[PDB]
Amino acid sequence: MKASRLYTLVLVLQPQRVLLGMKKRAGRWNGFGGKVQEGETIEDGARRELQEESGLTVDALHKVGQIVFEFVGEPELMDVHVFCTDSIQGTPVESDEMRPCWFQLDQIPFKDMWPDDSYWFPLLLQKKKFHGYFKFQGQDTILDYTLREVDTV
Numbered sequence: 001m002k003a004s005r006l007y008t009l010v011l012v013l014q015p016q017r018v019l020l021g022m023k024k025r026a027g028r029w030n031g032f033g034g035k036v037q038e039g040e041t042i043e044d045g046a047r048r049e050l051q052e053e054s055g056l057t058v059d060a061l062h063k064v065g066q067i068v069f070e071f072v073g074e075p076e077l078m079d080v081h082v083f084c085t086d087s088i089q090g091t092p093v094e095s096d097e098m099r100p101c102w103f104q105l106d107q108i109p110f111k112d113m114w115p116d117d118s119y120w121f122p123l124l125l126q127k128k129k130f131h132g133y134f135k136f137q138g139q140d141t142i143l144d145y146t147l148r149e150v151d152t153v
């Protein structure tokens, strides 16, 4: 089995809307996150990436899922720890690399999100926790995947 590198993904989910970020430099909407750094907990890495990438701070996050991504032709797996929060501080900030935008929860832009999000983000919305795995050929094609609702992440 390949080695895996730790990542975070943060969904700011309010009762009627979700905040996503568009990659500018591209075209795909995603939650906020990035690589976990040496010596920080995964949750602290998620908080740090949210602040670095969007400007938002949060006191805490709730872990809702974990998804492992495999890409054909790449040696490492991405082990993505997925967090949610409903409570924010500040306004999101656009950078050279990311543009944040709110979407109503009847306008989730699935066609412009990673394809896997169509499978797990419905579970997140139902207050469910999940473990997933997706194997991609390039950015658009899933060759294999597993998804399971779990009681504990």
Ligand SMILES: Nc1[nH]c(=O)nc2c1ncn2[C@H]1C[C@H](O)[C@@H](COP(=O)(O)OP(=O)(O)OP(=O)(O)O)O1
Pocket: 007, 008, 009, 010, 030, 031, 032, 033, 034, 035, 069, 078, 080, 114, 115, 116, 117
């Ligand atoms: N298939 C997928 N579905 C999804 O919803 N999010 C994915 C995904 N594949 C990767 N991601 C997320 C995980 C993580 O939040 C982000 C990938 O991390 P990045 O490459 O953005 O890390 P960094 O911000 O550390 O990188 P740099 O800014 O290049 O240093 O994209």
Ligand code: NA
Pocket: 033, 034, 035, 049, 052, 053
């Ligand atoms: Na980042």
Ligand code: NA
Pocket: 034, 035, 049
């Ligand atoms: Na980073």
Ligand code: NA
Pocket: 032, 033, 034, 035, 053
């Ligand atoms: Na990032």
